[PDB]
């Protein structure tokens, strides 16, 4: 099974005579889909991996200045100039400073001074455009009627057997048909990149910390930047946003850098969506994928089965899930072959009357070996009740009081 | 010769990140270094059930900790009247062809 | 106030309430920091594996 050890679990029932069961999948959220005569499936959106993107803008948050130089002329002589003004790697500024008989000239007033310095970046961030064409959603399915993960030792395990398969959903390929096998085929025509992840979002990378940022919030980040084309010794634009030179007492201006800007922007995207995980593929931490479920060509596994006879015996203690459902795991201990597990909630013992709801539709034992275990889930009624599985002879009861 | 009053840390790096978690009904988690200073810890609950290895369902109990360490500090000193040493330059008129001094 | 190598003057009522880690005196080797949680954020959403 799957989808039992989570809180964000959403139960939905399928219309009798209808094959469309629309549902919403989200990161960290599970969905349990049930029908009247169709098997119960547990679907979950596991990963949203985006990859193979191109950079748009690259902002610098750690800049280092170098090569401080200046050239100045006295008031009446005119405006100052320095050769490094025409250089694309230098930031300059023209300001007025006191001049007169004291310094170097013969007239009092304000002379012109130009101060240039060689800009260079030490640490920068890169934002990329994630076009709808390249991102892969992953959805995991798990049908009820198995113990934990049989023969497949992991939980994801494999795609090679029934009850377990992964369906990759991506825009330009939204519809998908999951070949469960034996149980049939579960269709899902999901709705990718419209349920969420609109084109306002860029994939921002800074110091291995990744995020998704809005459309114009990334455009006007007040930092030096260069466009989406990378070459050696890049050309930085608006370097003055990180290199400030404002006036001193007089006679010269000082140029200082704005220090680092990593934590300054760390607090600037509070609440923004996060995509921390890496491995050459951005693994998102948020999802709101809308999907449509097609229950046309799936069928119950245990409909042509006869009821099991060699009564069960409990394996673990029946536990109450987070939403009130009951879960039990039992070892059948009889080589009846493939047979249908009789499961029922009984308020009394006179007649085993249906009192509540059964989550795992028609539990079935799997193999023909001697001892086999299986897990099923039930929906108890509010108040006192019992739990009985097996034929009347050698029944097993467990007192259960829910809410 | 001023003295420090309060020094802030604006660049820090953590290490020795460790966590401890127990399934529900097993009380609360605990770590050995959680009482040690220069550590940051937080106790919260996570979803736990049979799929994780357990006997019951519900919220577990886990505490995480990391060894705090500062990389760059900023220091705030006190300006006490013990050292202010103002210098006042004087220049009289009647001579001194050119310059300030 | 001195932070990297540049220095400023600061109103003490503003300096006393800077939300950052801090210690009182002049501990050189191994300081005992106060409010270490100012820089260590713990994202922990109910699923699993608080970061």
């Amino acid at each position, epitope marked *: 099974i799957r989808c039992i050890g989570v809180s964000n679990r959403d139960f939905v029932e399928g219309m009798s005579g209808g094959t469309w069961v629309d549902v919403v999948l989200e990161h960290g959220g599970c969905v349990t889909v049930m029908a009247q005569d169709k098997p119960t499936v547990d679907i979950e959106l596991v990963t949203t991996t985006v990859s193979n993107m191109a950079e748009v803008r690259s902002y610098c948050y750690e800049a280092s200045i170098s090569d401080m130089a200046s050239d100045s002329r006295c008031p009446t002589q005119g405006e100052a100039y320095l050769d490094k003004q025409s250089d694309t790697q230098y930031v300059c500024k023209r300001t007025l400073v006191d001049r007169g008989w004291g310094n170097g000239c013969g007239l009092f007033g304000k002379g012109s001074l130009v101060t240039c310095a060689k800009f260079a970046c030490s640490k920068k961030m890169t934002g990329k455009s994630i076009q709808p064409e390249n991102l892969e959603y992953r959805i995991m399915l798990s049908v009820h009627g198995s113990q934990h993960s049989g023969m497949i*030792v*992991n939980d994801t395990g494999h795609e090679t057997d029934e009850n377990r398969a992964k369906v990759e959903i991506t825009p330009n390929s939204p519809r998908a048909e999951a070949t469960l096998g034996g149980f049939g085929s579960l269709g899902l025509d999901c709705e990718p990149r419209t349920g969420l992840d609109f084109s306002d979002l860029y994939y921002l990378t800074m110091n291995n910390k990744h995020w998704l940022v809005h459309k114009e919030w990334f455009h006007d980040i007040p930092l030096p930047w260069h466009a989406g084309a990378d070459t050696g010794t890049p050309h930085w634009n608006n370097k003055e946003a990180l290199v400030e030179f404002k006036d001193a007492h007089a006679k010269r201006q000082t140029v200082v850098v704005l220090g680092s800007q990593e934590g300054a922007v760390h607090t600037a995207l509070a609440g923004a969506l996060e995509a921390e*995980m*890496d*491995g*050459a593929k951005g693994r998102l931490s948020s999802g709101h994928l809308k999907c449509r479920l097609k229950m046309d060509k799936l069928r119950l596994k245990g409909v042509s089965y006869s009821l099991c006879t060699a009564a069960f015996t409990f*394996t673990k203690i029946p536990a109450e899930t987070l939403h009130g459902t009951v879960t039990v795991e039992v070892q059948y201990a009889g080589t009846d072959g493939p047979c249908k597990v009789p499961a029922q909630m009984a308020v009394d013992m006179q007649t085993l009357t249906p009192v509540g709801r059964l989550i795992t539709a028609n539990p079935v034992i799997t193999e023909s070996t001697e001892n086999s275990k299986m897990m099923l889930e039930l929906d108890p009624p509010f108040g006192d009740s019992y739990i009985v599985i097996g034929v009347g002879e050698k029944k097993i009861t467990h007192h259960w009081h829910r809410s | 010769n001023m003295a420090e009053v309060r020094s802030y840390c604006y660049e820090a790096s953590i*290490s*020795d*990140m*460790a*966590s*401890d*978690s*127990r*399934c529900p*009904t*097993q009380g609360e988690a*605990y770590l*050995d*270094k959680q009482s040690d200073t220069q550590y940051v810890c937080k106790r919260t609950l*996570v979803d*736990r059930g049979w799929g*994780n*290895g*357990c*006997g*019951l369902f519900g919220k*577990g109990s*886990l505490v*995480t900790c990391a060894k705090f360490a500062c990389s760059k500090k900023m220091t705030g000193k006190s300006i006490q009247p013990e050292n202010l040493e103002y210098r006042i330059m004087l220049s009289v008129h009647g001579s001194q062809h050119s310059g300030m001094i | 106030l001195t932070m990297n190598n540049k220095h400023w003057l600061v109103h003490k009522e503003w300096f006393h309430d800077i939300p950052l880690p801090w210690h009182a005196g002049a501990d050189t080797g191994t300081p005992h920091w106060n409010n270490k949680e100012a820089l260590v954020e713990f994202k922990d959403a109910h699923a*699993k*594996r*608080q970061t």
Partner: antibody
Amino acid sequence: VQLQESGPGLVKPSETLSLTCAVSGYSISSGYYWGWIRQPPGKGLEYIGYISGSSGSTYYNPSLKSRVTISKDTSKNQFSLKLSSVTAADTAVYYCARRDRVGSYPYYYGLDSWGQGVLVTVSS
Amino acid sequence: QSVLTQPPSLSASPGASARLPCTLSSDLSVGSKNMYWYQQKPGSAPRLFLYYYSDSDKQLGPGVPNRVSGSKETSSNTAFLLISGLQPEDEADYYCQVYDGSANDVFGSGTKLTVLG
């Protein structure tokens, strides 16, 4: 996550020993401390140390404190161990194993997935 | 200190319940220690066998059955590796493991369990 060990056949005493470990099925730098454990001829398991996947911090053994140095490189998805100034008693069967440090499931706080293992002697 | 200890050899007839203890050092409280058990076939790269902390906080190996149980006796702090359905393929070397205050791996000597015949 099936780790394969590769290393030289023999090293002379007091000579640098290097073992290379390819994980081959899981991306390093996601977490999951990677370590090295040995069993000299037939005795119990002795551990040497492990390196952090994401951060890269190295935690070693108190007895093997000044001789070993564990390296990591995620470009080709491998991590190695360097044993300097080996002794005759250091002949062992080494295994690079996996381990989780921050997870909420204590089963993975132990060495879940193991490597194949190499045998190395220190004879002449 | 902080060393685990347990006998070099144990054996039992196939079918009976074999209990493999693990006595921790005096500076440890086994009631709050996550016990880790490793199984090593003679030459095949020991695998994780059973982690046990409590009768409701336990997790076994990927394929080992429920015959393998764990328990703790907190009177004299000593974990247990219980194997109920002793088959001939349970003949292997078993280790136990805990962690110190600084989270350094502390392994045990382990018992070379032999299934008789």
